[PDB]
Enzyme design. Structure first.
Site, PDB file in Angstrom:
ATOM      1  N   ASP A 154      53.678  38.464   2.763  1.00  0.00           N
ATOM      2  CA  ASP A 154      52.646  37.791   3.587  1.00  0.00           C
ATOM      3  C   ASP A 154      51.218  37.899   3.022  1.00  0.00           C
ATOM      4  OD1 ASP A 154      54.826  37.268   5.242  1.00  0.00           O
ATOM      5  OD2 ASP A 154      53.835  37.909   7.090  1.00  0.00           O
ATOM      6  N   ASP A 175      57.348  35.201   1.636  1.00  0.00           N
ATOM      7  CA  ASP A 175      56.468  34.339   2.425  1.00  0.00           C
ATOM      8  C   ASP A 175      54.996  34.570   2.076  1.00  0.00           C
ATOM      9  OD1 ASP A 175      58.932  33.711   3.558  1.00  0.00           O
ATOM     10  OD2 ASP A 175      58.491  34.537   5.540  1.00  0.00           O
TER      11      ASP A 175
HETATM   12  C1  LIG Z   1      49.209  38.741  24.369  1.00  0.00           C
HETATM   13  O1  LIG Z   1      48.530  37.527  24.038  1.00  0.00           O
HETATM   14  C2  LIG Z   1      47.191  37.540  23.455  1.00  0.00           C
HETATM   15  O2  LIG Z   1      46.356  38.335  23.867  1.00  0.00           O
HETATM   16  C3  LIG Z   1      46.839  36.579  22.352  1.00  0.00           C
HETATM   17  O3  LIG Z   1      48.022  35.964  21.828  1.00  0.00           O
HETATM   18  C4  LIG Z   1      47.760  35.150  20.675  1.00  0.00           C
HETATM   19  O4  LIG Z   1      48.171  35.879  19.502  1.00  0.00           O
HETATM   20  C5  LIG Z   1      49.491  35.562  19.038  1.00  0.00           C
HETATM   21  C6  LIG Z   1      50.414  36.779  19.185  1.00  0.00           C
HETATM   22  O5  LIG Z   1      50.339  37.315  20.513  1.00  0.00           O
HETATM   23  C7  LIG Z   1      50.072  37.872  18.173  1.00  0.00           C
HETATM   24  O6  LIG Z   1      51.054  38.917  18.219  1.00  0.00           O
HETATM   25  C8  LIG Z   1      50.010  37.281  16.765  1.00  0.00           C
HETATM   26  O7  LIG Z   1      51.253  36.819  16.202  1.00  0.00           O
HETATM   27  C9  LIG Z   1      51.691  36.518  14.870  1.00  0.00           C
HETATM   28  C10 LIG Z   1      52.588  35.278  14.886  1.00  0.00           C
HETATM   29  O8  LIG Z   1      51.899  34.169  15.482  1.00  0.00           O
HETATM   30  C11 LIG Z   1      53.890  35.564  15.633  1.00  0.00           C
HETATM   31  O9  LIG Z   1      54.800  34.475  15.475  1.00  0.00           O
HETATM   32  C12 LIG Z   1      54.549  36.830  15.084  1.00  0.00           C
HETATM   33  O10 LIG Z   1      55.041  36.667  13.744  1.00  0.00           O
HETATM   34  C13 LIG Z   1      56.082  37.533  13.258  1.00  0.00           C
HETATM   35  C14 LIG Z   1      55.618  38.300  12.016  1.00  0.00           C
HETATM   36  O11 LIG Z   1      54.445  39.077  12.280  1.00  0.00           O
HETATM   37  C15 LIG Z   1      55.330  37.323  10.882  1.00  0.00           C
HETATM   38  O12 LIG Z   1      54.979  38.059   9.705  1.00  0.00           O
HETATM   39  C16 LIG Z   1      56.552  36.434  10.632  1.00  0.00           C
HETATM   40  O13 LIG Z   1      57.616  37.242  10.098  1.00  0.00           O
HETATM   41  C17 LIG Z   1      58.709  36.656   9.382  1.00  0.00           C
HETATM   42  C18 LIG Z   1      60.023  36.995  10.095  1.00  0.00           C
HETATM   43  O14 LIG Z   1      60.030  36.514  11.445  1.00  0.00           O
HETATM   44  C19 LIG Z   1      60.262  38.504  10.101  1.00  0.00           C
HETATM   45  O15 LIG Z   1      61.558  38.811  10.635  1.00  0.00           O
HETATM   46  C20 LIG Z   1      60.149  39.045   8.679  1.00  0.00           C
HETATM   47  O16 LIG Z   1      61.175  38.662   7.751  1.00  0.00           O
HETATM   48  C21 LIG Z   1      62.354  39.429   7.472  1.00  0.00           C
HETATM   49  C22 LIG Z   1      62.084  40.455   6.363  1.00  0.00           C
HETATM   50  O17 LIG Z   1      60.944  41.272   6.696  1.00  0.00           O
HETATM   51  C23 LIG Z   1      61.873  39.768   5.012  1.00  0.00           C
HETATM   52  O18 LIG Z   1      61.886  40.745   3.969  1.00  0.00           O
HETATM   53  C24 LIG Z   1      62.945  38.714   4.710  1.00  0.00           C
HETATM   54  O19 LIG Z   1      64.193  39.343   4.383  1.00  0.00           O
HETATM   55  O20 LIG Z   1      63.121  37.825   5.820  1.00  0.00           O
HETATM   56  C25 LIG Z   1      63.461  38.459   7.063  1.00  0.00           C
HETATM   57  C26 LIG Z   1      63.667  37.412   8.125  1.00  0.00           C
HETATM   58  O21 LIG Z   1      63.737  37.769   9.325  1.00  0.00           O
HETATM   59  O22 LIG Z   1      63.768  36.219   7.769  1.00  0.00           O
HETATM   60  O23 LIG Z   1      58.919  38.654   8.067  1.00  0.00           O
HETATM   61  C27 LIG Z   1      58.731  37.232   7.962  1.00  0.00           C
HETATM   62  C28 LIG Z   1      57.473  36.971   7.170  1.00  0.00           C
HETATM   63  O24 LIG Z   1      56.984  37.932   6.532  1.00  0.00           O
HETATM   64  O25 LIG Z   1      56.970  35.824   7.148  1.00  0.00           O
HETATM   65  O26 LIG Z   1      56.986  35.789  11.843  1.00  0.00           O
HETATM   66  C29 LIG Z   1      57.305  36.683  12.919  1.00  0.00           C
HETATM   67  C30 LIG Z   1      57.760  35.896  14.119  1.00  0.00           C
HETATM   68  O27 LIG Z   1      57.900  34.654  14.002  1.00  0.00           O
HETATM   69  O28 LIG Z   1      57.984  36.518  15.179  1.00  0.00           O
HETATM   70  O29 LIG Z   1      53.640  37.932  15.110  1.00  0.00           O
HETATM   71  C31 LIG Z   1      52.444  37.737  14.343  1.00  0.00           C
HETATM   72  C32 LIG Z   1      51.575  38.964  14.445  1.00  0.00           C
HETATM   73  O30 LIG Z   1      51.972  39.925  15.142  1.00  0.00           O
HETATM   74  O31 LIG Z   1      50.475  38.972  13.844  1.00  0.00           O
HETATM   75  O32 LIG Z   1      49.091  36.186  16.719  1.00  0.00           O
HETATM   76  C33 LIG Z   1      49.437  35.093  17.579  1.00  0.00           C
HETATM   77  C34 LIG Z   1      48.432  33.992  17.376  1.00  0.00           C
HETATM   78  O33 LIG Z   1      47.488  34.161  16.618  1.00  0.00           O
HETATM   79  O34 LIG Z   1      48.576  32.718  18.070  1.00  0.00           O
HETATM   80  C35 LIG Z   1      48.304  31.486  17.396  1.00  0.00           C
HETATM   81  C36 LIG Z   1      46.819  33.995  21.035  1.00  0.00           C
HETATM   82  O35 LIG Z   1      46.468  33.265  19.853  1.00  0.00           O
HETATM   83  C37 LIG Z   1      45.552  34.504  21.731  1.00  0.00           C
HETATM   84  O36 LIG Z   1      44.797  33.402  22.255  1.00  0.00           O
HETATM   85  C38 LIG Z   1      45.879  35.494  22.853  1.00  0.00           C
HETATM   86  O37 LIG Z   1      46.464  34.793  23.959  1.00  0.00           O
END
Ligand SMILES: COC(=O)[C@H]1O[C@H](O[C@@H]2[C@H](O)[C@@H](O)[C@@H](O[C@@H]3[C@H](O)[C@@H](O)[C@@H](O[C@@H]4[C@H](O)[C@@H](O)[C@@H](O[C@@H]5[C@H](O)[C@@H](O)[C@@H](O[C@@H]6[C@H](O)[C@@H](O)[C@@H](O)O[C@@H]6C(=O)O)O[C@@H]5C(=O)O)O[C@@H]4C(=O)O)O[C@@H]3C(=O)O)O[C@@H]2C(=O)OC)[C@H](O)[C@@H](O)[C@H]1O
Length: 342
Positions: A154, A175
């Site tokens: 990332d 990624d």
């Molecule tokens: C509570 O609400 C609020 O206060 C605010 O919310 C907003 O923020 C949101 C959100 O709440 C916040 O946590 C954050 O989220 C981002 C992202 O948007 C989410 O989808 C989520 O992403 C995770 C992960 O962090 C990413 O790196 C990515 O990961 C993928 C795979 O999913 C993961 O499994 C992994 O891959 C494995 C393995 O590690 C790898 O080696 C290979 O073998 O592949 C594997 C596989 O599974 O395929 O890593 C992958 C990668 O590196 O790309 O996606 C994940 C997912 O989809 O779940 O979490 C992120 C984070 O925690 O930072 O930000 C959000 C945001 O900004 O919204 C637009 C609102 O924005 C705000 O207004 C408030 O309301």
């Protein structure tokens, strides 16, 4: 005509200089007049969040001016909670009309050392994403020229608006360019890194993981670039060009993989070494909590006149026509924005 509002230096003998980049940025008057900071050679162990519009950083040299910090998504804060992927970034851009030139931005999280740790080691992190540069929804018109971005998983998180990367180096594994932004890359070296922890015959990584909304015209566009292996130890057919990231997203009916995040990655006139095998699928969780797979053939994954050993043309690697390729000029991709430096 080039002049600096502030200068950052490791030397006190340098003159009227700031010791940290954060200090220099903070010294800027409130508002949106251009503010340009020269950063002299050195490694600055800092994490930055840019919230002032029209801010511009210029390093003395890409090789020598480095902004670096070590933070993984799974790194714990003081309260014991994780930083998370967004939170792991060394530099976060949350303002408009930002530029950086002639500098390196690193996330120093030691991914290989982490993976080499014994499984029972409580310090071994599972959430291994470690972002070097994050352009948020509040960054639009972000310009990076002669910049090097360093990470593993990332490395570059491009969200929201338009960004332009020119004469750049970007390294990583899984990624390493990902997100929903309109991000144009021209004359860049995209460096796929060695994975000591991956068995022969398994996938080492993916250059891109676009989450581009289906109604957004442009996602990740890579032009006139070089897709290269870090070393001869990076196996043939070990890296995908992209897989479709459908981010976990909060909807009215729950939190699950966004169905409408149908990512675009387009390569035009780009060289590829034989570490590239093509495109790939990616999994998420659906509205019911079940595994769901998103396939490359259903995503906006295209090439135009790729060359080098990794550039095979087949049914699994869709090609643009000449007419379609004309839609991916800088002018069309960036619209009314012409990236310029101070
Ligand atoms: C509570 O609400 C609020 O206060 C605010 O919310 C907003 O923020 C949101 C959100 O709440 C916040 O946590 C954050 O989220 C981002 C992202 O948007 C989410 O989808 C989520 O992403 C995770 C992960 O962090 C990413 O790196 C990515 O990961 C993928 C795979 O999913 C993961 O499994 C992994 O891959 C494995 C393995 O590690 C790898 O080696 C290979 O073998 O592949 C594997 C596989 O599974 O395929 O890593 C992958 C990668 O590196 O790309 O996606 C994940 C997912 O989809 O779940 O979490 C992120 C984070 O925690 O930072 O930000 C959000 C945001 O900004 O919204 C637009 C609102 O924005 C705000 O207004 C408030 O309301």
């Amino acid at each position: 005509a080039t002049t600096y509002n502030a200068v950052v230096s490791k030397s006190s003998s340098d003159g009227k200089t700031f010791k940290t980049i954060a200090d220099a940025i903070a010294s800027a008057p409130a508002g949106s007049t251009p503010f340009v900071i020269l950063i002299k050679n050195g490694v600055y162990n800092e994490r930055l969040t840019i919230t002032r519009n029209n801010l511009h950083l210029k390093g003395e040299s890409r090789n020598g001016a480095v902004i670096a910090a070590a933070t993984a998504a799974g790194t714990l804060k003081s309260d014991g909670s994780k930083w998370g992927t967004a939170g792991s970034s060394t530099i976060t851009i949350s303002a408009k009309d930002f530029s950086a030139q002639s500098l390196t931005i690193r996330n120093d999280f030691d991914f290989p050392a982490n993976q080499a740790k014994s499984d029972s080691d409580s310090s071994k992190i599972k959430d291994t994403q470690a972002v070097a540069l994050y352009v948020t929804k509040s960054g639009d018109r972000a310009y990076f020229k002669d910049v090097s971005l360093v990470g593993y998983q990332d490395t570059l998180y491009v969200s929201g608006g338009r960004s332009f990367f020119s004469d750049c180096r970007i390294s990583g594994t899984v990624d390493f360019i990902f997100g929903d932004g309109t991000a144009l890359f021209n004359n860049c070296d995209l460096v796929s890194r060695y994975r000591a922890d991956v068995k022969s015959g398994n996938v080492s990584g993916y250059l891109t993981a676009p989450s581009t909304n289906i109604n957004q015209k442009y996602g990740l566009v890579i032009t006139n670039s070089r897709v290269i292996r870090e070393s001869d130890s990076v196996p043939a057919k070990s890296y995908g060009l992209g897989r479709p990231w459908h981010p976990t997203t909060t909807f009215s009916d729950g939190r699950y993989a966004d169905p409408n995040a149908i990512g675009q990655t387009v390569f035009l006139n780009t060289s590829m070494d034989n570490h590239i095998y093509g495109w790939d699928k990616m999994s998420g969780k659906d509205k019911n909590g079940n595994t769901i797979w998103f396939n490359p053939e259903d995503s906006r994954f295209f090439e135009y006149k790729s060359y080098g050993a990794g550039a095979t043309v087949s049914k699994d690697r869709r090609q643009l026509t000449d007419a379609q390729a004309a839609e991916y000029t800088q002018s069309k991709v960036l619209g009314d924005w012409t990236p310029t430096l101070p």
